[PDB]
Design a protein around this ligand. Structure first.
Ligand SMILES: NC(=O)c1ccc[n+]([C@@H]2O[C@H](COP(=O)([O-])OP(=O)(O)OC[C@H]3O[C@@H](n4cnc5c(N)ncnc54)[C@H](O)[C@@H]3O)[C@@H](O)[C@H]2O)c1
Ligand SMILES: NC(=O)c1ccc[n+]([C@@H]2O[C@H](COP(=O)([O-])OP(=O)(O)OC[C@H]3O[C@@H](n4cnc5c(N)ncnc54)[C@H](O)[C@@H]3O)[C@@H](O)[C@H]2O)c1
Ligand SMILES: NC(=O)c1ccc[n+]([C@@H]2O[C@H](COP(=O)([O-])OP(=O)(O)OC[C@H]3O[C@@H](n4cnc5c(N)ncnc54)[C@H](O)[C@@H]3O)[C@@H](O)[C@H]2O)c1
Ligand SMILES: NC(=O)c1ccc[n+]([C@@H]2O[C@H](COP(=O)([O-])OP(=O)(O)OC[C@H]3O[C@@H](n4cnc5c(N)ncnc54)[C@H](O)[C@@H]3O)[C@@H](O)[C@H]2O)c1
Ligand SMILES: CC1(C)CCC(Cc2cc(O)c(-c3ccccc3)c(=O)[nH]2)CC1
Ligand SMILES: CC1(C)CCC(Cc2cc(O)c(-c3ccccc3)c(=O)[nH]2)CC1
Ligand SMILES: CC1(C)CCC(Cc2cc(O)c(-c3ccccc3)c(=O)[nH]2)CC1
Ligand SMILES: CC1(C)CCC(Cc2cc(O)c(-c3ccccc3)c(=O)[nH]2)CC1
Ligand code: NA
Ligand code: NA
Ligand code: NA
Ligand code: NA
Lengths: 267, 267, 267, 267
């Protein structure tokens, strides 16, 4: 397989619609041996991870918890063996309180909420890299998930700002990881119908945000020269696996778009 | 003059080498009537502002202080008159603790420090816009200061991340300000020899950062097709005044480079 | 005025809807003394230029004609006086045969047609600069017109490719012009209702291109935080004059957007 | 292997240092069955291609020759079998006469030379796609070679302009190819020590271009977080194969950087 024998840490599974669930599924199908992390609802997460193709141990990780981060390498070493290291790490983690993403006015998001969203969505890409690099092999690969924030848009609001920050963090992570022969890259995915995204369709964020999301999705598939299926996470998972593989060995600090080509077309 | 009769708020003066000091000087030379804001050391700041071409009132503003922000419009109205509004606002504010900018490893900056730097350097562009827009005229202009963060670099570290966030914030400020006919733009300046920058030359951040800064500055002037004089803030001040004027009336959400053209040349 | 006393060459007037007509009008209103150039239909152009604020001299210039280019500096000197020099030059020239812009398939444009369009629309920015620089003052400014080609789009086709080339040419012109103290920049304008653009509305390029143009224009005004009026060339003309002035003295090799901010917003 | 069973056309082999030679070598090692094309020196190319892992058929293709292009699909079918189709196509073709790339002044390149270089280096990406798409499978992939032209640089001159045009062409090829389920992308490679590049080191383009090339290459390896070995084309070849594979199925109209991460770092 594409990832035969590689040991890969996958963060960010919470449901079977999580992008990270599909990353993990494809990685296992491609021969990878996974370690998974979960935040908060560990019992619920294990129910989900048992439906992956193969067994994988689950470790707790709250990226705001410095004790979790400081112990993470040693906890990984306990499960993969002290003499073994990881070849890949996937950051598939994001959060922004409703005040910063949705129908609340952009100007009205309190700093404490934006700061928490920035912590989880952008700063933690650096935190995770710092925590895992001591147990990563030379030639390894760190991959995070992005949503193209080059231009402003309805509703995404401060999450857009967090993604812009994340892209900048990735370039500095690449500097540090490169010293020990590890690549760092983001995959900028088009919109994917997770459970939360289905709730937006149903008006959970507000009817206005629901209309804006539909407008975005229809235009995305239209613009994309090869189309875009929001209900199919597999192309995104495959692209992450491509970056975890040895087939893009000279790409780092970079952003690879798994978006149907939509961002290359104006209309 | 270029700004004849325009009422403009200028933040960010702390020394006579502050970029904002030169923005204020050129604006006054061009006919603008200024309101100034200062942070913390008001007595020291007034000593500086008395050396500007013309008198200007000074109001206190700590952008982390929500009481200062909430009262700012009314305090402006008290000095310019209740029936009058501002035509221009300049954000020339930045901060990052030494743990996030300098020789400290990128991975070792504590979140609390990065969060404070993000608050002052990026979030506050939105906070200031929210505070001032109620007292801004249609046709007005908000301008902030940027340092091109498209690529990573030595020492700038988390300030680079804050600038990447600032660029994203600017695009959302433009959305909001556009509703009431106000433009929002950043000026990406080349390196300017402020007092703090002279301290880096002298090794205050560390000899390694001093060498990196010299390497950056020499290359900047070399790359720039028209050269770059770090000891001359006037071209930057003029560019800010251009954006405050009525001569770029269809530019918003954007970044104008006052950098000698350096960013357009690889070497 | 903004351009008081400056001597400026303006290419590209063919009708009173030409962007160059409005550049010339605003520049004269701001005190510039113009030299105009015209291609082919010189008698028609003279009739149009008599509608400008002030009568100005007209020189013939076909940018594909090396004799016109080689004689241009001397012909300028005959108009402005021996020993006098230009302060500004405006390139407002474009062309693409119908095989390369419109409803003809992208793959079906013959090379000879694309080459001619590349010659007039991109290569000639360099040719014009070479021809005029010997009679330009230090501190001068060369400005060309762009339509953002970062993303592909319907109908614009090989003209998009020519604009991508033009942006690259501009960065090299800036290198050469900077040696003699002259800036070079492009203004990326939103869509403007010239007579030819009105013909597209009327279906002259085909009903499909008419529909695509309407879709582009409606979306442009929607996206632009300050709106976009295709029937108002004045904001574009003002922006060109800003770059011809002394108020952006550290910007070269660059692209300034006069587009309502539309390119900074996804939707 | 990564490309098991795929039928792939590879243009651009002239020496065993050609990037296309290494693309072909890796593709064969990964199970692809190749059709090769060669320009002009067919007997010399045959001698080179016999050094590949597996003997492969060679077709003549001058991309300026419309008869070669119009007959190409039928000639491919004669080689692969009537009814069979290609899965991948590699454009690894470039040319610029010495007047347009080297030490000759940018302004002094004659149009005829720039036009020829534009024809071969940019227009032909579209010509090749038009010629091959009728014999490409759905799910196929077209890949071309790029050198990042976002910023100007010494010596590359009009070849930089051709690459800027090529990137724009690629976005339009993606539009057309997407209609039949085919992706189109470019790989932006760092500098590779081909025989011609070795000649630059030896001063064949002039001592000044030799010095500029060395400065570019030393800086490239320095900037790249994972380093850059100009003498190792394999990472570039692997990246092209990644795009020819099924592992980046949602990327089109795009540019993937195989450059060590250098373009993401300022210094
Ligand atoms: N869904 C899309 O349309 C889309 C598009 C592009 C990018 N992305 C990005 O993909 C990533 C995964 O999102 P998703 O759409 O799969 O949604 P998701 O809700 O399934 O995944 C987000 C994950 O982040 C985790 N997380 C939140 N706070 C955390 C913390 N303190 N510590 C550790 N983990 C924490 C959640 O538990 C969850 O597993 C995010 O970065 C998201 O921004 C999503
Ligand atoms: N100096 C350069 O080389 C350079 C280059 C490009 C951009 N910039 C930007 O220009 C702007 C001005 O910086 P400068 O170089 O003139 O330095 P400076 O130190 O003179 O100005 C920074 C200002 O921010 C103010 N500030 C800090 N915390 C604040 C708070 N809580 N509330 C209000 N104001 C606060 C300081 O009091 C000071 O007046 C910053 O955004 C900086 O990032 C500087
Ligand atoms: N109209 C828009 O929506 C729009 C938007 C953005 C940019 N632009 C650009 O603005 C510029 C001016 O276009 P416009 O819309 O005013 O249309 P226009 O037709 O009025 O101007 C184009 C000019 O190019 C001249 N020209 C053509 N071939 C020439 C040659 N061989 N030598 C000299 N001059 C030659 C024509 O005579 C004409 O004066 C062009 O670069 C165009 O691409 C136009
Ligand atoms: N060498 C580098 O540093 C470098 C870096 C980035 C990108 N590239 C690109 O990689 C590609 C391959 O270049 P290379 O460095 O391997 O050099 P090369 O000389 O080995 O390959 C260029 C090829 O183009 C072919 N070609 C020229 N005119 C042609 C025509 N009329 N019809 C068909 N083929 C024609 C030549 O025969 C040759 O095989 C080019 O696009 C080049 O711009 C090269
Ligand atoms: C209305 C809107 C623009 C439609 C597209 C979506 C895409 C998207 C991005 C994104 O980062 C997320 C996300 C954010 C935080 C945590 C988990 C997931 C998402 O759900 N959806 C973002 C909102
Ligand atoms: C070593 C280094 C890259 C040299 C160039 C400078 C330019 C620079 C940017 C900048 O934002 C600032 C700045 C930051 C925070 C507060 C006040 C000012 C600065 O001093 N100097 C940044 C550091
Ligand atoms: C259908 C379409 C995308 C709508 C927008 C227009 C904008 C536009 C650009 C442009 O460069 C021109 C142009 C091109 C060549 C010569 C003179 C003018 C134009 O008319 N219109 C281009 C076509
Ligand atoms: C001096 C300079 C900037 C150093 C780096 C090289 C990189 C490079 C790109 C490139 O497109 C080529 C190329 C161009 C045309 C035909 C075949 C190959 C090259 O040889 N070298 C280009 C020249
Ligand atoms: Na589509
Ligand atoms: Na220089
Ligand atoms: Na609008
Ligand atoms: Na390096």
């Amino acid at each position: 397989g594409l990832l035969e024998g590689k040991r890969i840490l996958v963060t960010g599974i919470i449901t079977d619609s999580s992008i990270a669930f599909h990353i993990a599924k494809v990685a296992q199908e491609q021969g990878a041996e996974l370690v998974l992390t979960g935040f908060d609802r560990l019992r619920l997460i294990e129910r989900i991870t048992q439906r992956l193709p193969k067994p994988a141990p689950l470790l707790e990780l709250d990226v705001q918890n410095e004790e979790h981060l400081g112990s993470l390498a040693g906890r990984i070493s306990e499960v993969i063996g002290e003499g073994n290291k990881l070849d890949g790490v996937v950051h598939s983690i994001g959060f922004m309180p409703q005040s910063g993403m949705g129908v609340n006015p952009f100007f009205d998001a309190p700093f404490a909420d934006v700061s928490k969203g920035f912590h989880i969505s952008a700063f933690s890409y650096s935190s995770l890299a710092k925590a895992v690099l001591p147990v990563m092999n030379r030639g390894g690969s760190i991959v995070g998930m992005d949503f193209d924030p080059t231009r402003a848009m309805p509703a995404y609001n401060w999450m857009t700002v967090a993604k812009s920050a994340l892209e900048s963090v990735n370039r500095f992570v690449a500097r540090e990881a490169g010293k020990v022969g590890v690549r760092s890259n983001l995959v900028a995915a088009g919109p994917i119908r997770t459970l939360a995204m289905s709730a937006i369709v149903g008006g959970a964020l507000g009817d206005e945000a629901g209309q804006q999301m539909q407008l975005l999705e229809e235009g995305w598939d239209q613009r994309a020269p090869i189309g875009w299926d929001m209900k199919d996470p597999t192309p995104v998972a495959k692209t992450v696996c491509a970056l975890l593989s040895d087939w893009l060995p000279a790409t780092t600090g970079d952003i690879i778009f798994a978006d149907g080509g939509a961002h290359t077309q104006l209309l």
